[PDB]
Design a protein around this motif. Structure first.
Motif, PDB file in Angstrom:
ATOM      1  N   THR A   1      -6.073 -18.509  -6.991  1.00  0.00           N
ATOM      2  CA  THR A   1      -5.419 -17.699  -7.724  1.00  0.00           C
ATOM      3  C   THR A   1      -6.189 -16.327  -7.323  1.00  0.00           C
ATOM      4  O   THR A   1      -5.725 -15.141  -7.808  1.00  0.00           O
ATOM      5  N   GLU A   2      -7.533 -16.206  -7.159  1.00  0.00           N
ATOM      6  CA  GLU A   2      -8.259 -15.139  -6.651  1.00  0.00           C
ATOM      7  C   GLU A   2      -7.657 -14.041  -5.716  1.00  0.00           C
ATOM      8  O   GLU A   2      -7.428 -12.785  -6.243  1.00  0.00           O
ATOM      9  N   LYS A   3      -6.919 -14.386  -4.807  1.00  0.00           N
ATOM     10  CA  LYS A   3      -6.405 -13.269  -3.775  1.00  0.00           C
ATOM     11  C   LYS A   3      -5.048 -12.896  -4.490  1.00  0.00           C
ATOM     12  O   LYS A   3      -4.694 -11.413  -4.381  1.00  0.00           O
ATOM     13  N   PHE A   4      -4.543 -13.788  -5.158  1.00  0.00           N
ATOM     14  CA  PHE A   4      -3.183 -13.371  -5.916  1.00  0.00           C
ATOM     15  C   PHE A   4      -3.539 -12.407  -7.183  1.00  0.00           C
ATOM     16  O   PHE A   4      -2.837 -11.363  -7.224  1.00  0.00           O
ATOM     17  N   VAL A   5      -4.501 -12.615  -7.784  1.00  0.00           N
ATOM     18  CA  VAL A   5      -5.017 -11.515  -8.983  1.00  0.00           C
ATOM     19  C   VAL A   5      -5.251 -10.228  -8.319  1.00  0.00           C
ATOM     20  O   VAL A   5      -5.002  -9.229  -8.769  1.00  0.00           O
ATOM     21  N   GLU A   6      -5.981 -10.236  -7.030  1.00  0.00           N
ATOM     22  CA  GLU A   6      -6.497  -9.041  -6.416  1.00  0.00           C
ATOM     23  C   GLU A   6      -5.028  -8.039  -5.859  1.00  0.00           C
ATOM     24  O   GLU A   6      -5.047  -6.995  -6.286  1.00  0.00           O
ATOM     25  N   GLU A   7      -4.083  -8.999  -5.572  1.00  0.00           N
ATOM     26  CA  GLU A   7      -3.028  -8.390  -5.095  1.00  0.00           C
ATOM     27  C   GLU A   7      -2.143  -7.686  -6.083  1.00  0.00           C
ATOM     28  O   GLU A   7      -1.608  -6.632  -6.234  1.00  0.00           O
ATOM     29  N   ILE A   8      -1.959  -8.358  -7.416  1.00  0.00           N
ATOM     30  CA  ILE A   8      -1.183  -7.726  -8.633  1.00  0.00           C
ATOM     31  C   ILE A   8      -2.154  -6.768  -9.352  1.00  0.00           C
ATOM     32  O   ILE A   8      -1.593  -5.802  -9.720  1.00  0.00           O
ATOM     33  N   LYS A   9      -3.385  -6.959  -9.161  1.00  0.00           N
ATOM     34  CA  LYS A   9      -4.135  -5.936  -9.692  1.00  0.00           C
ATOM     35  C   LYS A   9      -3.990  -4.656  -9.151  1.00  0.00           C
ATOM     36  O   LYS A   9      -3.785  -3.534  -9.523  1.00  0.00           O
TER      37      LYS A   9
ATOM     38  N   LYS B   1       0.867  -1.221  -0.157  1.00  0.00           N
ATOM     39  CA  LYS B   1       0.122  -0.094   0.032  1.00  0.00           C
ATOM     40  C   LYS B   1       0.863   1.351   0.003  1.00  0.00           C
ATOM     41  O   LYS B   1       0.714   2.178  -0.973  1.00  0.00           O
ATOM     42  N   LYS B   2       1.752   1.403   0.937  1.00  0.00           N
ATOM     43  CA  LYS B   2       2.739   2.358   0.965  1.00  0.00           C
ATOM     44  C   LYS B   2       3.639   2.415  -0.327  1.00  0.00           C
ATOM     45  O   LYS B   2       3.839   3.574  -0.997  1.00  0.00           O
ATOM     46  N   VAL B   3       4.173   1.299  -0.636  1.00  0.00           N
ATOM     47  CA  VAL B   3       5.165   1.392  -1.978  1.00  0.00           C
ATOM     48  C   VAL B   3       4.375   1.896  -3.146  1.00  0.00           C
ATOM     49  O   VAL B   3       5.115   2.582  -3.908  1.00  0.00           O
ATOM     50  N   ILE B   4       3.165   1.341  -3.537  1.00  0.00           N
ATOM     51  CA  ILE B   4       2.447   1.690  -4.485  1.00  0.00           C
ATOM     52  C   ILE B   4       2.166   3.292  -4.265  1.00  0.00           C
ATOM     53  O   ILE B   4       2.258   4.016  -5.312  1.00  0.00           O
ATOM     54  N   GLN B   5       1.730   3.832  -3.403  1.00  0.00           N
ATOM     55  CA  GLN B   5       1.240   5.244  -3.102  1.00  0.00           C
ATOM     56  C   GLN B   5       2.585   5.822  -3.301  1.00  0.00           C
ATOM     57  O   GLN B   5       2.577   7.010  -3.974  1.00  0.00           O
ATOM     58  N   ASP B   6       3.820   5.596  -3.060  1.00  0.00           N
ATOM     59  CA  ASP B   6       4.822   6.341  -3.276  1.00  0.00           C
ATOM     60  C   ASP B   6       5.498   6.424  -4.751  1.00  0.00           C
ATOM     61  O   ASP B   6       5.758   7.395  -5.359  1.00  0.00           O
TER      62      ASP B   6
ATOM     63  N   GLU C   1       5.174   9.696  -7.160  1.00  0.00           N
ATOM     64  CA  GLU C   1       6.293  10.224  -8.145  1.00  0.00           C
ATOM     65  C   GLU C   1       6.116   9.993  -9.721  1.00  0.00           C
ATOM     66  O   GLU C   1       6.824   9.962 -10.491  1.00  0.00           O
ATOM     67  N   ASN C   2       4.760   9.810 -10.130  1.00  0.00           N
ATOM     68  CA  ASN C   2       4.555   9.679 -11.323  1.00  0.00           C
ATOM     69  C   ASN C   2       4.842   8.347 -12.023  1.00  0.00           C
ATOM     70  O   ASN C   2       5.073   8.671 -13.337  1.00  0.00           O
ATOM     71  N   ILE C   3       4.944   7.316 -11.353  1.00  0.00           N
ATOM     72  CA  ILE C   3       5.498   6.069 -12.154  1.00  0.00           C
ATOM     73  C   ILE C   3       4.118   5.213 -12.553  1.00  0.00           C
ATOM     74  O   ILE C   3       3.736   4.791 -11.724  1.00  0.00           O
ATOM     75  N   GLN C   4       3.801   5.328 -13.857  1.00  0.00           N
ATOM     76  CA  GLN C   4       2.661   4.547 -14.483  1.00  0.00           C
ATOM     77  C   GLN C   4       2.959   3.023 -14.363  1.00  0.00           C
ATOM     78  O   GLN C   4       4.155   2.661 -14.665  1.00  0.00           O
ATOM     79  N   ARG C   5       2.302   2.060 -13.825  1.00  0.00           N
ATOM     80  CA  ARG C   5       2.678   0.969 -13.578  1.00  0.00           C
ATOM     81  C   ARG C   5       1.779  -0.229 -14.269  1.00  0.00           C
ATOM     82  O   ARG C   5       0.535  -0.019 -14.208  1.00  0.00           O
TER      83      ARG C   5
ATOM     84  N   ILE D   1      -1.544  -3.399  -7.737  1.00  0.00           N
ATOM     85  CA  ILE D   1      -0.027  -2.530  -8.296  1.00  0.00           C
ATOM     86  C   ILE D   1      -0.222  -1.809  -9.685  1.00  0.00           C
ATOM     87  O   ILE D   1       0.371  -0.873  -9.704  1.00  0.00           O
ATOM     88  N   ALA D   2      -1.333  -2.268 -10.359  1.00  0.00           N
ATOM     89  CA  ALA D   2      -1.314  -1.552 -11.778  1.00  0.00           C
ATOM     90  C   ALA D   2      -2.017  -0.259 -11.616  1.00  0.00           C
ATOM     91  O   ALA D   2      -3.074   0.025 -10.515  1.00  0.00           O
ATOM     92  N   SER D   3      -1.518   0.811 -12.449  1.00  0.00           N
ATOM     93  CA  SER D   3      -2.197   1.893 -12.407  1.00  0.00           C
ATOM     94  C   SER D   3      -3.605   1.913 -12.990  1.00  0.00           C
ATOM     95  O   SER D   3      -3.952   0.956 -13.741  1.00  0.00           O
ATOM     96  N   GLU D   4      -4.499   3.000 -12.748  1.00  0.00           N
ATOM     97  CA  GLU D   4      -5.828   3.153 -13.354  1.00  0.00           C
ATOM     98  C   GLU D   4      -5.590   3.599 -14.711  1.00  0.00           C
ATOM     99  O   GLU D   4      -4.551   4.418 -14.850  1.00  0.00           O
ATOM    100  N   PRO D   5      -6.367   3.356 -15.672  1.00  0.00           N
ATOM    101  CA  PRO D   5      -7.422   2.099 -15.340  1.00  0.00           C
ATOM    102  C   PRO D   5      -6.907   0.756 -15.071  1.00  0.00           C
ATOM    103  O   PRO D   5      -5.856   0.276 -16.003  1.00  0.00           O
ATOM    104  N   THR D   6      -7.515  -0.053 -14.051  1.00  0.00           N
ATOM    105  CA  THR D   6      -6.894  -1.183 -13.803  1.00  0.00           C
ATOM    106  C   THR D   6      -6.650  -2.273 -15.087  1.00  0.00           C
ATOM    107  O   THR D   6      -5.685  -2.977 -15.249  1.00  0.00           O
ATOM    108  N   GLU D   7      -7.888  -2.310 -15.822  1.00  0.00           N
ATOM    109  CA  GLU D   7      -8.031  -3.468 -16.772  1.00  0.00           C
ATOM    110  C   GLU D   7      -7.096  -3.165 -17.907  1.00  0.00           C
ATOM    111  O   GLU D   7      -6.921  -4.111 -18.777  1.00  0.00           O
ATOM    112  N   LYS D   8      -6.672  -1.790 -18.069  1.00  0.00           N
ATOM    113  CA  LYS D   8      -5.418  -1.597 -19.108  1.00  0.00           C
ATOM    114  C   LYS D   8      -4.101  -1.854 -18.809  1.00  0.00           C
ATOM    115  O   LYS D   8      -3.126  -2.044 -19.344  1.00  0.00           O
ATOM    116  N   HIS D   9      -4.242  -1.682 -17.370  1.00  0.00           N
ATOM    117  CA  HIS D   9      -2.633  -1.922 -16.737  1.00  0.00           C
ATOM    118  C   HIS D   9      -2.333  -3.177 -16.237  1.00  0.00           C
ATOM    119  O   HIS D   9      -1.270  -3.497 -15.744  1.00  0.00           O
ATOM    120  N   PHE D  10      -3.169  -4.175 -16.042  1.00  0.00           N
ATOM    121  CA  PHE D  10      -2.884  -5.459 -15.450  1.00  0.00           C
ATOM    122  C   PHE D  10      -3.188  -6.491 -16.523  1.00  0.00           C
ATOM    123  O   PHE D  10      -4.398  -6.340 -17.346  1.00  0.00           O
TER     124      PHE D  10
END
Ligand SMILES: [Ca+2]
Ligand SMILES: [Cl-]
Length: 194
Positions: free
Chosen positions: A151-159, A122-127, A131-135, A161-170
């Protein structure tokens, strides 16, 4: 003009490793790499973090492709994804390693498991967001599916990390051999979204 850092889970459950280096080759060969064009750095993490090469190590696509093919799988019992992302933010995206003031920053994270340090995400992603890093985040479901693990919790965790919109970045990738299939879409979005 983009500084792109690829953050690779090296854990030994990813197999065969040729699938990852093929993904790197196909993605990077579509870029115009140079100090005044696109720059690429690559970090690999497992239990610890290693800079395979800095953003300004290589000044041509030809050079980056030669280096990317030679990246070895480093393994690891634990998956420290937050450490990998945070190290990319705090070390890879620094002027000392070639990062350029004012260019677009993109991180591409490739992983096949939930992270032992997920409490830090949560903190690492917010940082990174500050800093304007698209993920762009890529979950490879191969080893989990082969072990009959949910894999459901795994998918939620990796989603997360992705920038919004999530479905374009994950990207949900079923198995290692399917990784190369996302290259065209991923590359288009890296150079189209902000
Ligand atoms: Ca793993
Ligand atoms: Cl310098």
């Amino acid at each position: 003009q983009l500084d792109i850092v690829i953050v690779l889970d090296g854990s030994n459950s990813i197999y065969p490793w040729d699938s990852v280096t093929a993904f790197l080759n196909d993605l990077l060969e579509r870029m115009d790499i140079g100090p005044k064009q696109t720059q690429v750095g690559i970090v690999q993490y497992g239990e610890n973090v290693t800079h395979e090469f800095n953003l300004n190590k290589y000044s041509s696509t030809e050079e980056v492709l030669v280096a990317a093919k030679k990246i070895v799988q480093r393994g690891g019992r634990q998956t420290m994804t937050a450490l990998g992302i945070d190290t990319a933010r705090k070390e890879a995206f620094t002027e000392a390693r070639g990062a350029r003031r004012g260019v677009k920053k993109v991180m591409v994270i490739v992983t096949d498991g939930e992270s032992h340090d997920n409490h830090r995400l949560k903190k690492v992603i917010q940082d990174c967001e500050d800093e304007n890093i698209q993920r762009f985040s890529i979950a490879i479901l191969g080893s989990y599916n082969r072990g009959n693990l949910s894999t459901e919790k795994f998918v939620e965790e990796i989603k997360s990390i992705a920038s919004e919109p999530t479905e374009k970045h994950f990207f949900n990738v079923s198995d290692e051999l399917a990784l190369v299939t996302i290259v065209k879409t991923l590359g288009e979005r890296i150079f189209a979204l902000e």
